[PDB]
Symmetry: D2
């Protein structure tokens, strides 16, 4: 359903649903359905002065597929609703280019290979424990942090902008940056005025 | 959808995201079995999937009802500004029947007139103050708690159900019970499966188990 | 610590968990004191504040007991990331006091009547509403119903438990000339107590994060 | 007050604000009191009984927890609280892993002796960790190298939570339906809670506790 952006080798960010648009913030700000452009001007005004409450009335629901180490960083954003999966087994294997700029003792290709290898061994050990009757909740603890998980994320535009301020930044890990770029992309698509105003006055990051 | 409450109040649905299937989709992270799922989640206390259904209501209510309402913190509220917003200057005047049930020294319709009288005296003093040059943020402090205010309320289904458990109940003041009934009505029309499961498995209040819709 | 506000209000500190060091321990995720270093610890507080790392300050918590007019309480309660427990108008026995603006309050606005008259006019209507209320009560009318005729300047009381992070957001918005003068007075008192208990955080706050105007002008 | 959990974990109390009376004062919205336990604890039961839990939001705890990441992930799903997890950016990083005891597999008829499963887990852990160190040695930054480490790697965090949110936590984790590992951490949390707020804790078990192991 709807927009879908592939991230990393097997990940993605999919837009499930969206409630409202830029006008939803305007209506809430004026507190009126009948008496809900001077409107785009209002959006900028609210953003400039930090009147963020109206933006809480725009809501998004995303379906995200990401490695657990990315999900854990993501989940630290408490002002939102999450529902994580609880079953296929895939892992994020960094591409050689990911090691861009680092003078590694061994070739990038080899680093990618070493990572694929322990992932392989951990996974085969997991399947073995399972086959012997070991409980899934127990056997799964040997699986690596690059294992892909999936979750639904329902978040309002205000909370989404705080999310972007922290993750859509060069100081954030590249992997999470990629997901934040995808989220920003969808946000931009569905709320042009809010997103533009956000970049103009409130965006604290540097990659957008 | 706009349901009139009390003498001048109302509850109006502004927008809504998703429906019963949004919770099923969230639960699975992906016919009659979907209904079975909704029922299962409700029966075992798995409330998180219902956070993926969201509503935005426009409510016009007396400030004393609004204040009680705002205690439900897991939601978003945007109310008119007492300092700068234009108001309708309307006030909730209880009907004689509202009193009936309590032994009073004077007729219920008398209690109604006295309330309407003091409200009239307060309002008059307010305008007198405004015309005199007194700023609204100060002049409005003399207006009574039964003055009507308006606000936008964006809330997810899980939180909405928690609100109904507490407000759609005999222990809550009659005025807010009336609003909770309107909220429940709209909730039912938009999420019939979640609503029925809610009544059958999680509703802690009492009035919705007897009051239709 | 109890500070009077307005004519019959106040802000009173009930309790507090932690101090500046609580944010430092949380930032380092360490319950080790055998390495205390004021210099380094105070530097970390500035660093966190300067770079917007707010989560550590969530581990410092305050509980205040506030007495304020309902119109002030309404504005205050819009700060949702905190816990509030207010007196019950339906049951709790109120003391029935009201905020009567001082003539100086209006002093500064062109009025068609002496500031003194406004004060008298407000005091008069309050008295009338209050009497009606009692008159309704003496008739057997439930207070949850009779209290609706009471004006918005009626005083209420509530306990407020908030962490330092949320407290700073509150000050950013309320300890500012844009906020109503009345709530500004309460915010200054909250800031005074906050400064007393977490001097390092308060200073770093004023230096790197405070968005308002008045706290950099008015002492403590 | 510290309680060891699992093989290398623990739960320790860093701080606490208030006690049973903090909820009482909040409920009554009054700082003073003067002299009455019988009345105080009756109010506490009254509140718990009728579901009036806002007063309990005025009792706060700060815990320091050491737990395997898979347990932490479940724990962090409780949003009404404040968390700060260990970071090499402010503190030194440690590398330990949760190795299940053979007993953990009791009740399960596994074709592999429980004590051998324990062995296989340690085996994979040791190899993943060695690969990790090797990647570090080659010049791979930690943020990338650590992705090969297992979910049983131990982490640490500070957790500040009020009594109300704490009771909800127990209702979901201090129960036979929660994974065993988290049940053990929840038990420790319940123990510290009982110690600092005996009245609230007693009332909780009597009228509201939804779990079964407590």
């Amino acid at each position: 359903h709807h927009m879908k952006i592939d991230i990393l080798d097997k990940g993605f960010v999919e837009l499930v649903d969206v409630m409202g648009n830029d006008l939803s913030a305007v209506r809430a700000a004026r507190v009126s359905f009948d008496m809900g452009e001077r409107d785009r001007h209002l959006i900028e005004y609210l953003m400039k002065h930090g009147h963020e409450t109206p933006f809480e009335h725009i809501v998004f629901t995303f379906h995200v597929k990401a490695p657990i180490f990315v999900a854990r960083q993501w989940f630290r954003h408490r002002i939102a609703s999450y529902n994580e999966l609880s079953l296929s087994y895939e892992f994020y294997i960094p591409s050689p280019e990911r090691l861009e700029g680092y003078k590694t003792t061994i070739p990038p290709e080899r680093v990618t290979e070493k990572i694929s290898e322990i992932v392989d061994k951990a996974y085969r050990t997991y399947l073995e424990l399972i086959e012997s009757g070991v409980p899934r909740e127990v056997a799964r603890i040997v699986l690596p942090l690059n294992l892909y998980t999936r979750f639904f994320w329902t978040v309002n535009a205000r909370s989404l902008m705080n999310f972007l301020n922290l993750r859509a930044d060069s100081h954030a890990q590249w992997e999470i940056q990629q997901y934040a770029l995808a989220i920003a992309r969808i946000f931009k698509e569905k709320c042009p005025w809010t997103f533009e105003a956000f970049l103009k006055y409130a965006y604290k990051g540097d990659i957008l």
